[model samples]
Target: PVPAIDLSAMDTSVRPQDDFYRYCNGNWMKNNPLKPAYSRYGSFDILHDSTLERVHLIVDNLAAGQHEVGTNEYRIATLYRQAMDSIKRNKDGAAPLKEDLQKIEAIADRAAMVKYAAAKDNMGGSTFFGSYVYADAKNSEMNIFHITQTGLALDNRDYYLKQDAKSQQIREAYVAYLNKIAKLAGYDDEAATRIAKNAMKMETELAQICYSKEELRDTHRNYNKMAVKEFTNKYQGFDWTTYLADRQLTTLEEWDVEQLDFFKKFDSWFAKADLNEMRDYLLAGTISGAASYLSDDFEQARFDFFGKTLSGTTEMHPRWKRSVGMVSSFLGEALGEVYVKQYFPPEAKERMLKLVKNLQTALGERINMLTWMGDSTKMKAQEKLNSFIIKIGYPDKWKDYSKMEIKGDSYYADIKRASKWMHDDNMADLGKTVDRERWLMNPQDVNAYYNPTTNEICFPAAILQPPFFNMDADDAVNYGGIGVVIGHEMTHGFDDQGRNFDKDGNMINWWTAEDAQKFETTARKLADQFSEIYVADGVRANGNMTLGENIADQGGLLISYLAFRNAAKGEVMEEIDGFTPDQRFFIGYARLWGQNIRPEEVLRLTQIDVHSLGELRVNQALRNIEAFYEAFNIQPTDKMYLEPEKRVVVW
Candidate 1:
């Protein structure tokens, strides 16, 4: 029962040198096929399921008990209970969104339509463009309103614009889904078809002008800070005043317009397009957004296209599971407060802090050892590293849910209230000082993030569990598991996009010209290595798009290995369970990425996901590491081997 590296899960038939990912995970993959409800199955998915089961237990207990009003327990229980009431949801049959759909139908003029669109966006409806409050990339101390391109119903703009067979199929399926939803929203068959056609045309035009995924990755290019007046003048034909007034976002000095060209084009298009077609597009967005929350028919229609067609998931998730997800999403911190109390302990935080400090020290040493970077850049890099904020387990403060109303009936109504409350909460941050203590994720989420603007890394409690970090595991295993994650987040501060920011979280370049060129040359080499990996049928992973994650992975592994060696200074590193310490360390890393993914998912993920596939992550990433070769005695003739000079070691 070694939690970190399951020795029994290894396949003896597969040689480690030929395919390390398969060698480490073949047996587990053989034993665990893709579940009906999952498009991809992996160690992360396993942990997520366990966490949700725990949440189910907690919510189920609350549902079965009596609780005082206005408590977190009461709110969570009420919301979960209402969501689980599928009978009521099915019987209501799109009644919840009736008035909202009518509101879109009632638009009398272009100004009224724009005002309605902005107001609905605040309540979580889809719109041609969306606005939110985020910490200013340059200022980093105050939150400002940001307008960004959003409207496409597909996963990415590529889906609508790409002419490939796969993209066309997806686009077709999306149109049919829209038509079905429109018909369900009380439009006649002919009207629904016309609405879907117009909606598709409008979305396609928008997609053509929208930024590609790769372009969006460049933080500097995306940060277009402009005065409100300047924005209105440049993007003529739209009444910014009326839109802002409707959203209650008043008196803004400047705003971050992410896609200047996209906004400008949309403004012109809005002026020229037929008003009826625009109305239908708006109606389509409303129906599409509310599809899942409406009725059983609507939910099934959504699952067929989004769940089955896009992701290749064979079946809809169980009702209770979907309910759990919805409740957790809308009231994350509320449910998270209870989750942390039961699952996370004070000891876990203490252990994580010590591990984080070791990784920090290890990164500082690596920074000093870099021969390519000059002393000036290295000093600033070290300064940024030292100023890093590490948040672990849970937030210091929990959000209040008192303003949100929940009932044990009408699931959609409760969700709407919760959505508006969350929306208003984000809106309240505008024109105010940034709240650094606020968390973007819940404690139970099985993922981690490194925010460049905040200069911080977050690790929720759920991601800190088995196969990642275990109290009983040895130092090598833990280092290869959660230790790499900590180092990974820390490394992101110096990744391609992150290196532009200074210690104060301002987007200022500190690198000398020669140093920046050297870094880019090395990074481009790394990206080129990944671009050669063919996932399936002529589709390759986008190396440029996934550059940041790849950099973090390589850096994280290197620093964690250094830290582990530093901690094992005086100890005799011997064989444990028939494997050397170094061998176990690499094995631990591979197991975290072991997964069974569907072909459709592979195609979809390649187009949209920023991270490489699990197979490529373990195999390609390790091939670049000299220590990984040394651990397993890989020869130059081995399939996984790369020449010493060819291997990338950039951090």
Candidate 2:
């Protein structure tokens, strides 16, 4: 059998202390080049490809077999088939979108526009302002409506406002794409160019009034709850009563206006702006949202701007892969019902439960051992740690998609209907008790999350196999892999945003004022260190935006290392393949984040993504770990050396 750690993957030429990421991943990086269709390729992509292939086999069989119409098998088959039919799709061109564009054209004034927006909102359509229902931060028991700032085509406001050449070049490509999409929506060439300018102007102003990505992370500043009447009166331009009634949300007692100044300006902006410009801006949004499924022209234009220009991928992903992704995403739980039985095993879930418990114990132990935190705060932290709702492998209950009709019509029509169905379903949750038992992710998703409002960590089935969790690997290796992942999600509960929420998931501070300052004081040093490292030629990483994830990474590494050592307390661990047990553990952690990425993607992810790049997640995070320093025997003269006083840990 193969060993848990591959000695062949390590570059013995490079010292482990200097660059552990390259030291573990050197050969892997050389062997695995970035595919033309991908931006960043790594360990995560391998599993994603594997999971996708499994679903592909299942969906292909379902589509080939005889089945009753409107059944789960039928729905999955129809969605997959419609997406794969490139001939019909290209033949239809923009014909499918004509009726939709007419709907945009029907809005003559503010009254009709609000009515249209309300109707669209009920069906999960895009608009100037987007709203959704979620648990109130303070209450955490009942659901409430949240009206938020939306409608920027660019990921963030900085893309429009920044004067850097990279930003400007991206903006130019975006303008070209906007014009291309507008022309497809029935505007002439010159008129399409004009529409592009008008749309850009509207979005730029929206971006200006909106919160920065970093500022949006502030839980206290963003949560502004008010009575429905007061909120409606405070921002008055659209017809609030008619709008709420149109959406059947009139029974709501309160709402959270996430961006106050944005909403205030939105009222005046929507009312005072040129109706044609608003129409054009919305038309651009309308078409761009649907462009990917429309035609080669629409899809290519999208790929040119977002793919080649922005992220620097050379080619679009193949049609089959994209179609499979759509089928899995739209009918997630429906597909997940079959996916788990085919791929997930009962023993895997049982082992994961035990690992989670051990990680929880280690986190609690580490929290109690914190020298800077007081007992008052430490006790609350222990309570929160013990209260973690662990969800592994799959959900106890699956989402019901029986009522969602997949018509086997054009791909566009079916997707629109599906979106509407989902929107209405979610909106029905308003005024209801929060369903904490619900799983936010599907079983097949190769991802994990720590939702602050739910105060729970989820590890979907697809992420639990080898590399992250190997049934064949030893305890030390598993701890370095999945154990670290479990700790990362756990530590998120104490991150900048998660710290605001209590054990019950309410927005209440449990830390003393002095302890809070002490926490920030150290967190700031970590942030500053990240800001000093450059991702691109001129652009350095944004420390403030990625602070929560950075803290989570640091805490995850520390807690898991403690847990690993604790599990080996009664035994003497032996070295394998000329590496000690401790060295093998840290090497496994470093290899998990290995990636080969395009420089363009490096720049793009830095701006929009909340998580740091892979190299940083490995190299920078390990620098703060004393055990890593001791395991690799890092010296003061080494390039990877960090002074003892400089390292910081929140947990």
Candidate 3:
């Protein structure tokens, strides 16, 4: 059924030129207040909640079905049942992690610490440094091992090093959280306090060497490939042979050290640091990672800091939701199979494919018409756009979970087994061919991503629904919603980081020097413009951190608008709900970004997230599009107006 535009959702009193976000969604925002269970709420959340409800149905049915053992269905059912058995979990509180805690407490020296950390890594935990096997950046044809800086209890390193009052409070709260978890594991009050402080000190030291979020955005700078023997010589303190042997990575030759400076300094620090401090730090990571599967007291303690203090969430989500999330994370593809068959129809996939083609054609035209870029660079851009692997709906093949056994006996044990299974599966890929068909996310996820290393844009079935895509909606609305998203992911190929890679998805420079400078000059201008806008009180958006998304947003709108106009040609256009096709297109885009978020979360996202705040995305990005100015008859007096000379067009 074709859904009508919600005329009541729009605030006619607000001028579109001055504040398009309010003009489109002010009434809806005024009516839809944030709930206790959410730190933020918007159109995305609405669809996500609906999707979760549908998933709840699938999970409940699986739980009731009589499936054979060793089957994916049986494992999914068993995992869900065990996780929901709160009575058993509370009765067995802290008992499941007792053995793992003892291992940390028994570490005698640096060698034992190294062995202990490595063993835990096999069970999917990292102590000082984390390693993973993935597609090589410069050589994407084969999978290889990569080591990077890790071992922070907080979400980011900034929480540990930022000396602001908010940072101080969060740090204190984190220490308290550590103490609570330690106390649950039988540490005395004084002992818990001492261990928490030591853990904090060690993490702060690690944080000092870690790269800032902005620094990590530079793809070329982070890719430091070296031979295995050279890596051992470069960082001398740890026994690389023993570490790799423990993780079954001894056969690997080449390695990519993601933060070379962090590894360089941490080698000496790891060798000479206090053994007890190291023990405490390892224990902190171990217990914190296991907190979600623990009892009510442990879960509450973990959530108090991570959810409340860190994200400003008021309460924990319901038990069923949490359990559902666990099952989905552990056995995503297994559940995704049922999700796709039940929810995503063939027609939806066909429509999504058509939309993608239209957006691709529009983007290619934009690339060919670029005035600042030379023809050589323009040809490279077209090559990348042509070579984009558009993965819509779902993967061609499903992941096999036959080896993963799930029993209804212990949730903690089930989780460990699942984590180990995943870890082993990843390690098994070492020295193997890159599985280009494999999916990073499942079909039921309400999100999309552009994988730069693979030069692919994946749109799972869940994100292909209303407000983003609908077969029955008008061309203008769908184009503004999912078409913009299509363009957004396509534009990512030419973003700051993605541009470092070539059409073959390897890290290689394809832009001419002069053209590269022109792109940078415009990108820097856009970043500077975003940096001036404050998202929350005293927290302006980080221009450098959000550069790629900002560029994508402006470019996506322009490209999507062009595509919509192309589609609208040779067709009769009429006003529905007193909105022209162009007006409806802009409103549709604005409505998708309608959100109200907590101030603390806004501040946190400014530091961590790569995307700008929703309101800013609409207001700031629209000002850069000339078509937007013409659609709304925007003037210099309007608050959202930007002089044509000052606007940026990086694409």
TM-score, cand. 1: 0.98
Tens-digit lDDT string for candidate 3 (1-651): 857356677888998988998998899889888877678888888888898888899999989989999998899889888888889999999999998888888888888877887888887777678888898998888898888887566657888898888789889999999999889877899888888899999999889888887887888778899888787866768877788778766766789999888888888888788988878887877788888887888899998987888778989889889988999998988888989999899989887888899999999999988899989989988998999898998998999988887776688888998988998899888878898878899999988888888899999999998888877888999988988998998889999989988887899889999999998998999899888887876777788789999988887898999999999889888987777899888988998888878877887788778988899889888888888888899999998898888788888
Which candidate order results from sorting by lDDT in descending order?
1, 2, 3
- Please give me the total number of clashing residue pairs in predicted model 1: 0
| lDDT tens readout by residue for model 1, 99-147 | 8778878989988878887878878655778788989999999899888
lDDT (Cα, 0-100) at 400 in candidate 3: 90
Tens-digit per-residue lDDT, 1-651, candidate 2: 546876677788888878889999888888889989999998889889999999889899988888887688888999888888889998999988998889988888878888988888878975778798889999888998898897578878899999978678888899999999889867899989988988898898889888898888888989899888986876667678888899887787789988877788777777787888888888888889899778888999999999999898999998888998898877888888899999899999998998889899999889988899888999888888888889998889888887888787688999998888788788889888999988888999998889888789999999998788889887778888888899999999999889988899999989999999999988898899889888878789988899999999888888888888999999888877777878878888887888899998998899899899999998888888888888988999888888888777677
Candidate 2's TM-score reads 0.98
What clash count does candidate 2 reach? 0
TM-scores of the candidates are: 0.98, 0.98, 0.98
Per-candidate Cα lDDT values, in order, are 0.87, 0.87, 0.86
Ten-residue segment with the worst summed lDDT in candidate 3?
Answer: 1-10
The C-alpha local distance difference test score for the whole of candidate 2 amounts to 0.87
